[PDB]
Design a binder for this molecule. Sequence first.
Ligand SMILES: Nc1ncnc2c1ncn2[C@@H]1O[C@H](CSCC[C@H](N)C(=O)O)[C@@H](O)[C@H]1O
Ligand SMILES: [Cl-]
Ligand SMILES: [Cl-]
Ligand SMILES: [Mg+2]
Length: 155
Amino acid sequence: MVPYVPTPKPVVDRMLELADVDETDVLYDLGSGDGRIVIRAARTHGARGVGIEIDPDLVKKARKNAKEAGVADLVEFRQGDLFEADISEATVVTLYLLPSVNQKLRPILFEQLSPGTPVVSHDFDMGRWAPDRTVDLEGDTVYRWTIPEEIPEDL
Ligand SMILES: Nc1ncnc2c1ncn2[C@@H]1O[C@H](CSCC[C@H](N)C(=O)O)[C@@H](O)[C@H]1O
Ligand SMILES: [Cl-]
Ligand SMILES: [Cl-]
Ligand SMILES: [Mg+2]
């Protein structure tokens, strides 16, 4: 079970840089919490955003946060389980979940996401799926992968 403890805002900024997020992107944050990843993607980079979040109290907070930030026209939140969500329109995916949850999610990412889609994770890796980047911050790690044209036979 993934607790609500958010990614610090400076770490969020580094995640968005690492994925080269820009105004043409549609960023999906899977387990979106207070909405900070999608809100900062919209405010800083002009990207459209979708946050998927299971807890209705956090969906409510995130919607309020987006309105207060002046980015409600760019950002949408959906109440639901991320393992059941349609994420195929994502051009970038961001994650701060758990090691076991990342492992369960991996095949869904391969099923739904277009080749070339960046995936960025705070702190937790994807097992034998090797990252393209690993950024060491003071007390946090950020990984990036790019969805390949062919899934490695190992995976
Ligand atoms: N199966 C699931 N589907 C959607 N959201 C889930 C989920 N399991 C846990 N969550 C949510 O995932 C969030 C993890 S905290 C991370 C929040 C945000 N992405 C950030 O980085 O700041 C919590 O808000 C929790 O309620
Ligand atoms: Cl919304
Ligand atoms: Cl790079
Ligand atoms: Mg890009």
